[PDB]
Amino acid sequence: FNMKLAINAKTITSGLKYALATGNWGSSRAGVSQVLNRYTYSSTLSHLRRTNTPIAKPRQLHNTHWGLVCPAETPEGQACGLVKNL
Amino acid sequence: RITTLDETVGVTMSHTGMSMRSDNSNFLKVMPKKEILDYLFKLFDEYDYWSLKGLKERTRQPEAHLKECLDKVATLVKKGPYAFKYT
Amino acid sequence: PIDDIVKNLLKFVVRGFYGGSFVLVLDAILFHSVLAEDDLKQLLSINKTELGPLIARLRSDRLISIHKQREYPPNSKSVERVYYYVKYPHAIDAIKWKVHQVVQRLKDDLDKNSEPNGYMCPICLTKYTQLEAVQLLNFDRTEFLCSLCDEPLVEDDSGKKNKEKQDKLNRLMDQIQPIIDSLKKIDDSRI
Amino acid sequence: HDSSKLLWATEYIQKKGKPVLVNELLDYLSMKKDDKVIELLKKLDRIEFDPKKGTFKYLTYDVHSPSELLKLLRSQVTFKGISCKDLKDGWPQCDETINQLEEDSKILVLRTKKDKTPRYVWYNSGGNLKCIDEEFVKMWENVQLPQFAELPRKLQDLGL
Ligand SMILES: [Zn+2]
């Protein structure tokens, strides 16, 4: 028996490095990890606090979003209302 | 909480991979033909049916001579309940 | 009888165009009308991978047909046994058609060596016929060139090879005369 | 044990290979002066014992001539077959007679020319037919038969 051949480190290293490296978290989940937007300071502040919702109408603003989700800061296009900001 | 090892890293990293230190812990370590013929007939007197490997484990001697002594006076049964046995 | 002449025909063809084990299996079926697979294996003491290609060869020539017979005896085991049976008419038809194909294929090779026509090119290893040869003839040259190499060609075929195709016809007829005579003897009764 | 003296006596008389006197057999074995070995030898049909003087005959097969070989072949039609050991032990060098017995007078199967050739003992009629040229055999294997009912139709169009 050998302790170097039983316990491998490339399973945890490749799993964490691969999951935090690619968009997938293992397709189940995709688009979790995104490159940080360094266009300005408010883009990084509004980028880190950005919350996503996977695909009643979920795009419309609900009354329970008072004080929790910004009623104005939301992108336009296909992902309108699915992306939210704290 | 989780304890952070504060050492110079190189010691622990040396203990990780190859460190020229193995073992240190026990875990999952795990002839005259006539006389041989007479002895074989004595074993036949004890019991007629015996496997060739068992005879090689009882007579305790070079096995080639024992095989040649079994191919002359005994017949090898390959099938049946006494399979792989000389009688 | 007529049935025995078919047996002698199969002995002459299988013995004359194949090895020994083929007539071993053949005679093993001529002795027992229904020959099991376990009987032929324990008979010739040959392996399964050695009994396979023999039966497959005797079936590819339409010599014998197989009959996978069921068995549910003692131990309730579905023991299947491939019983071989000689297919006389299909085997005779196979012999006649194969002889005809041998004669026709050995007659075509004699007409090619009777008169050389085409050429050959050593440089590009491409064959050229008389047509392309006379179509690649130039005025400043005295020999037929080659489009790939623009170099002269060498005359292909010769009359020396014509003596080989005739000996194959004569020897083939001398070795096929008893077979075709047995065929003409069997085809009288259509059995 | 006396059984080892019995089997040793039979192996010794097989090493001799010719009938000798019973007393001479007991003298060649030195210490084997038992009569129970002689009685067990009389009970053994493997080595036939002639009551006239001292004579020990050896069976597998009494075949040593090509005619006896042909008879032993005829005694295997629609049955099984023996091996090479019995014939080569009953008659030295049988493969020479096999090569001399041309055209199905003695058949075999040449496997390897390095392992004494595991033989075969069957009989037919001709079996030779090596006059068939190899070219005719190659032209016989290249013919692809039309399967199903295409072959009888292709033969009825030619007139056969
Ligand atoms: Zn060319």
Side-chain angles (χ1 to χ4, degrees), chain A, chain B residues 1-30 32 54 62 64 74 80-81 83, chain C residues 1-62 73-74 87-191, chain D residues 9 17 19 51 54 66-100 118 126-157 159:
Chain A
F1 190 81
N2 185 21
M3 295 298 300
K4 308 180 185 304
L5 314 186
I7 308 181
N8 301 119
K10 297 302 179 60
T11 302
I12 308 299
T13 302
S14 300
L16 299 172
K17 181 180 60 60
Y18 179 81
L20 278 79
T22 60
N24 300 120
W25 203 256
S27 300
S28 182
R29 289 170 175 171
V32 184
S33 179
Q34 300 179 357
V35 291
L36 184 55
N37 301 329
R38 290 191 171 276
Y39 295 155
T40 181
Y41 200 81
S42 178
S43 180
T44 312
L45 294 179
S46 60
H47 187 198
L48 295 184
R49 302 189 64 89
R50 164 177 284 100
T51 307
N52 198 333
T53 300
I55 301 180
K57 188 62 178 180
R59 299 182 180 270
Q60 296 179 356
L61 181 62
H62 197 266
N63 299 121
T64 56
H65 296 176
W66 172 266
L68 304 180
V69 180
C70 182
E73 182 182 346
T74 171
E76 63 281 353
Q78 292 77 7
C80 184
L82 296 177
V83 173
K84 304 176 175 72
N85 294 94
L86 303 177
Chain B
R1 269 71 162 283
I2 294 185
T3 64
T4 61
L5 270 71
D6 300 330
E7 288 75 12
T8 60
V9 176
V11 180
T12 60
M13 275 299 181
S14 67
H15 287 287
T16 55
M18 41 185 58
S19 181
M20 296 176 297
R21 297 180 60 180
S22 180
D23 190 270
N24 300 331
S25 60
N26 299 330
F27 181 77
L28 290 177
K29 298 300 180 180
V30 304
Chain C
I2 309 299
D3 303 329
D4 298 331
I5 309 180
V6 183
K7 300 180 180 60
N8 299 123
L9 175 68
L10 298 177
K11 292 178 180 299
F12 293 157
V13 171
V14 173
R15 268 157 43 189
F17 296 98
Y18 295 96
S21 56
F22 299 90
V23 81
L24 266 42
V25 179
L26 177 66
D27 297 330
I29 310 168
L30 293 180
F31 291 162
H32 300 274
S33 61
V34 281
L35 177 65
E37 183 176 328
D38 300 332
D39 300 331
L40 185 61
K41 191 265 180 300
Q42 299 295 334
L43 177 60
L44 302 180
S45 300
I46 59 180
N47 305 15
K48 307 299 297 180
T49 60
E50 298 178 330
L51 190 143
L54 299 180
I55 301 301
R57 181 61 60 180
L58 297 182
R59 290 176 300 180
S60 60
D61 303 321
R62 300 185 61 177
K87 197 56 176 296
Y88 307 94
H90 292 181
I92 297 176
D93 294 331
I95 296 166
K96 296 182 298 180
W97 203 78
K98 280 181 179 181
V99 167
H100 179 266
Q101 289 297 328
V102 167
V103 175
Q104 291 295 144
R105 285 180 180 180
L106 290 184
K107 185 60 180 180
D108 298 324
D109 300 331
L110 183 63
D111 301 321
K112 182 180 61 180
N113 299 121
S114 300
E115 180 67 25
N117 299 121
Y119 296 81
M120 60 180 180
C121 183
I123 298 175
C124 62
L125 291 64
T126 301
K127 299 300 180 300
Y128 294 88
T129 61
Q130 184 75 37
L131 287 72
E132 305 184 31
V134 304
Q135 286 298 316
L136 290 177
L137 177 59
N138 297 85
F139 312 100
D140 60 330
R141 298 293 292 102
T142 60
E143 294 172 333
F144 299 145
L145 297 182
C146 165
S147 175
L148 265 185
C149 307
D150 295 35
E151 292 190 55
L153 310 182
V154 187
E155 302 180 353
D156 192 29
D157 300 330
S158 180
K160 300 180 180 300
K161 299 180 180 180
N162 187 269
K163 303 300 180 180
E164 298 177 335
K165 307 304 180 300
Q166 181 65 26
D167 298 332
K168 295 180 180 60
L169 289 175
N170 297 123
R171 290 179 299 180
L172 194 272
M173 287 180 177
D174 297 331
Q175 296 297 333
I176 212 64
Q177 178 179 341
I179 298 182
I180 65 180
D181 288 332
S182 300
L183 293 172
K184 281 304 148 309
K185 182 60 180 180
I186 297 172
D187 293 331
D188 296 329
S189 300
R190 298 298 300 180
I191 302 180
Chain D
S67 301
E68 300 178 335
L69 198 50
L70 291 178
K71 299 300 180 300
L72 190 61
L73 291 160
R74 294 179 179 180
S75 62
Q76 299 298 329
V77 181
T78 69
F79 282 100
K80 298 299 180 179
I82 55 175
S83 61
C84 58
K85 300 294 300 179
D86 44 29
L87 299 181
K88 68 179 60 180
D89 293 331
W91 172 258
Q93 192 66 212
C94 294
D95 302 323
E96 186 271 348
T97 308
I98 302 170
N99 300 330
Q100 294 293 150
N128 178 59
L129 296 181
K130 68 177 184 299
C131 188
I132 305 297
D133 300 31
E134 301 286 67
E135 301 293 335
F136 303 150
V137 180
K138 295 301 180 300
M139 295 300 180
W140 186 271
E141 299 179 349
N142 296 330
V143 179
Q144 301 294 147
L145 302 171
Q147 301 294 334
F148 297 96
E150 301 178 349
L151 179 56
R153 298 183 301 180
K154 286 301 180 300
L155 286 183
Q156 288 296 144
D157 295 325

